[PDB]
Design a protein around this motif. Structure first.
Motif, mmCIF file in Angstrom:
data_model
loop_
_atom_site.group_PDB
_atom_site.id
_atom_site.type_symbol
_atom_site.label_atom_id
_atom_site.label_comp_id
_atom_site.label_asym_id
_atom_site.label_seq_id
_atom_site.Cartn_x
_atom_site.Cartn_y
_atom_site.Cartn_z
ATOM 1 N N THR A 129 77.144 38.943 22.389
ATOM 2 C CA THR A 129 76.135 39.982 22.577
ATOM 3 C C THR A 129 76.327 41.106 21.569
ATOM 4 O O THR A 129 75.360 41.643 21.031
ATOM 5 C CB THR A 129 76.202 40.509 24.013
ATOM 6 N N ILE A 130 77.577 41.448 21.268
ATOM 7 C CA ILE A 130 77.852 42.377 20.179
ATOM 8 C C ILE A 130 77.373 41.795 18.866
ATOM 9 O O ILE A 130 76.752 42.492 18.052
ATOM 10 C CB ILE A 130 79.356 42.711 20.144
ATOM 11 N N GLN A 131 77.634 40.505 18.643
ATOM 12 C CA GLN A 131 77.182 39.860 17.408
ATOM 13 C C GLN A 131 75.660 39.911 17.271
ATOM 14 O O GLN A 131 75.150 40.245 16.193
ATOM 15 C CB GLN A 131 77.701 38.422 17.348
ATOM 16 N N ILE A 132 74.921 39.633 18.367
ATOM 17 C CA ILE A 132 73.457 39.716 18.345
ATOM 18 C C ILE A 132 73.009 41.101 17.916
ATOM 19 O O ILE A 132 72.081 41.255 17.112
ATOM 20 C CB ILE A 132 72.854 39.358 19.719
ATOM 21 N N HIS A 133 73.656 42.128 18.445
ATOM 22 C CA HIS A 133 73.292 43.487 18.089
ATOM 23 C C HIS A 133 73.598 43.766 16.622
ATOM 24 O O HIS A 133 72.828 44.462 15.948
ATOM 25 C CB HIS A 133 74.025 44.470 18.994
ATOM 26 N N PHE A 162 76.467 49.657 33.735
ATOM 27 C CA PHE A 162 77.659 48.825 33.656
ATOM 28 C C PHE A 162 78.028 48.511 32.215
ATOM 29 O O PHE A 162 79.211 48.446 31.873
ATOM 30 C CB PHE A 162 77.457 47.507 34.411
ATOM 31 N N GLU A 163 77.023 48.307 31.353
ATOM 32 C CA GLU A 163 77.314 47.990 29.964
ATOM 33 C C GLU A 163 78.053 49.139 29.293
ATOM 34 O O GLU A 163 78.929 48.906 28.446
ATOM 35 C CB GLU A 163 76.023 47.668 29.219
ATOM 36 N N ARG A 164 77.736 50.383 29.678
ATOM 37 C CA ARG A 164 78.467 51.524 29.147
ATOM 38 C C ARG A 164 79.871 51.643 29.725
ATOM 39 O O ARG A 164 80.661 52.432 29.197
ATOM 40 C CB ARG A 164 77.680 52.816 29.358
ATOM 41 N N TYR A 201 85.468 46.333 19.715
ATOM 42 C CA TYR A 201 85.245 47.490 20.577
ATOM 43 C C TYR A 201 84.825 48.732 19.800
ATOM 44 O O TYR A 201 84.162 49.610 20.366
ATOM 45 C CB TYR A 201 86.497 47.778 21.388
ATOM 46 N N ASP A 202 85.163 48.817 18.511
ATOM 47 C CA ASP A 202 84.686 49.936 17.706
ATOM 48 C C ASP A 202 83.169 49.936 17.658
ATOM 49 O O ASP A 202 82.518 50.942 17.981
ATOM 50 C CB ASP A 202 85.243 49.844 16.287
ATOM 51 N N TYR A 203 82.591 48.799 17.271
ATOM 52 C CA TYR A 203 81.143 48.657 17.244
ATOM 53 C C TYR A 203 80.537 48.864 18.639
ATOM 54 O O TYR A 203 79.515 49.545 18.796
ATOM 55 C CB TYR A 203 80.805 47.282 16.663
ATOM 56 N N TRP A 204 81.155 48.268 19.660
ATOM 57 C CA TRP A 204 80.587 48.269 21.000
ATOM 58 C C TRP A 204 80.548 49.675 21.599
ATOM 59 O O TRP A 204 79.593 50.035 22.296
ATOM 60 C CB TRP A 204 81.378 47.297 21.897
ATOM 61 N N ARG A 205 81.589 50.471 21.385
ATOM 62 C CA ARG A 205 81.556 51.822 21.929
ATOM 63 C C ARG A 205 80.367 52.598 21.372
ATOM 64 O O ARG A 205 79.692 53.334 22.100
ATOM 65 C CB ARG A 205 82.869 52.541 21.628
ATOM 66 N N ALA A 206 80.065 52.404 20.096
ATOM 67 C CA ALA A 206 79.048 53.184 19.429
ATOM 68 C C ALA A 206 77.646 52.614 19.604
ATOM 69 O O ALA A 206 76.677 53.252 19.179
ATOM 70 C CB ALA A 206 79.383 53.290 17.942
#
Length: 366
Positions: free
Chosen positions: A135-139, A155-157, A172-177
């Motif tokens: 899902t991070i990759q899709i984004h 929940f995603e946050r 997680y760097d990408y995901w947090r932002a």
């Protein structure tokens, strides 16, 4: 007239009168939407899919029992072939593999890629971290992902702070932002006609697949057992309970929906997000209240569908014996009025009638 590549969920082959989970529910509904607009659907599926009267162009990758690695590579290969031939307005996925995500990018379809999710992030689960890793990759690739409820987006946050010994390969760097979901909800139900609320019998229903971990279906089927003649459980044969919990196996979705119309209550014991099963909104749309197991101060989807839902609050620390006693108590002592059935069905008819739902899909598929 709309040219769409469709990459299905892969736990079970497609059957329009079976929805064996929350992923299968959005899968079914986005397909129903694509069919209702006369989309040209290239469906990369399995030999045992059935589509009824629906016009889909089927590209089967084998007979589905357990999704195998060879099926996975045959699927990704067909993504690339089909993209080289036709031009696609969209490609639809339902929590795809790393391979499927890469094939979509290599085929130049990332920016028209629509992804739909139901599985809460579980760091101790290897396959689930794989789901959310992609899902991070899709984004990153420029695709878009959709959630069913605002509770899921919340929940995603929190998920982007959850780590384990299995989450080392997650950016997680990408995901947090980057909140991974779009602002738009996908519709969890499409009500083609205003449901007629029937008065309740004494029957209370459990209609979730059996697993002790995420759905806590043992807790549900303990309440079903304590109800005796006034309780019945439905489970798919791929996620069936042990013999101590008798349930109806593999009932068609329509059979379950018919029984529910006059059910006194629905049992839901999925205590984190309540979107791994669609049965809550099915029940509430018929005026059926949900008796909902929930962790204290968690958002849960059921309370969005019916804010007056009865909640059985517990903690992670609460031991299994006490959970079964708190939930059985709430089930056996449950009380509801007919007025309450009508009120909760109205609030859902406002949100999920076909005109509002089609508008919701139209906004997504632009």
């Amino acid at each position: 007239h709309m040219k769409v590549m469709f990459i299905p969920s892969r736990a079970v082959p497609f059957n329009p009168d079976r929805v064996q989970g929350g992923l299968e529910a959005v899968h079914l509904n986005v397909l129903k939407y694509l069919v209702s607009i006369g989309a040209d659907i290239d469906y990369i599926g399995f030999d045992n899919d059935t589509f009824g009267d629906w016009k889909v162009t089927h590209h089967p990758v084998g007979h589905l029992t357990k999704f195998s690695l060879g099926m996975s590579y045959t699927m990704a290969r067909k993504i690339v072939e089909l993209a080289g031939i036709h031009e696609y307005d969209f490609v639809v996925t339902m929590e795809p593999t790393k391979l499927t995500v890469q094939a979509i990018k290599d085929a130049g379809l990332s920016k028209v890629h629509k992804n739909f999710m139901a599985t809460p992030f579980e760091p101790v689960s290897r396959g689930i971290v794989q789901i959310w890793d992609q899902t991070i990759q899709i984004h990153k690739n420029g695709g878009k992902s959709y959630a069913p409820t605002k509770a899921f987006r919340e929940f995603e946050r929190k998920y982007c702070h959850m780590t384990s010994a299995l989450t080392d390969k997650i950016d997680y760097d990408y995901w947090r932002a980057n909140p991974l979901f779009e602002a738009e909800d996908y519709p969890v139900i499409c009500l083609n006609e205003k449901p007629e609320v029937l008065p309740a019998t004494d029957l209370i229903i459990s209609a979730q697949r059996y697993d002790t971990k995420m759905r806590r279906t043992d807790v549900a089927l303990e309440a079903i057992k304590a109800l005796g003649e006034n309780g019945v459980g439905y489970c798919p044969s791929k996620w069936a309970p042990p013999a101590k919990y008798p349930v109806i196996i593999d009932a068609p979705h329509s059979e379950i929906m018919e029984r529910l119309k006059t059910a006194k209550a629905l049992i839901n014991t999925c205590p984190d997000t309540g979107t791994v099963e669609n049965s809550s909104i099915e029940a509430i749309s018929k005026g059926v209240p949900v008796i909902q197991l929930v962790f204290k101060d968690y958002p849960h989807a059921t309370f969005e569908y019916d804010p007056d839902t009865v909640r059985v609050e517990i903690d992670f620390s609460t031991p299994k014996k006490e959970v079964v006693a708190l939930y059985t108590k709430a089930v056996l002592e449950f009380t509801d009025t007919y007025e309450a059935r009508v009120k909760r069905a109205e609030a859902v008819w406002k949100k999920y009638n076909r005109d509002a739902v089609v508008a919701m899909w139209d906004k997504i598929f632009t």
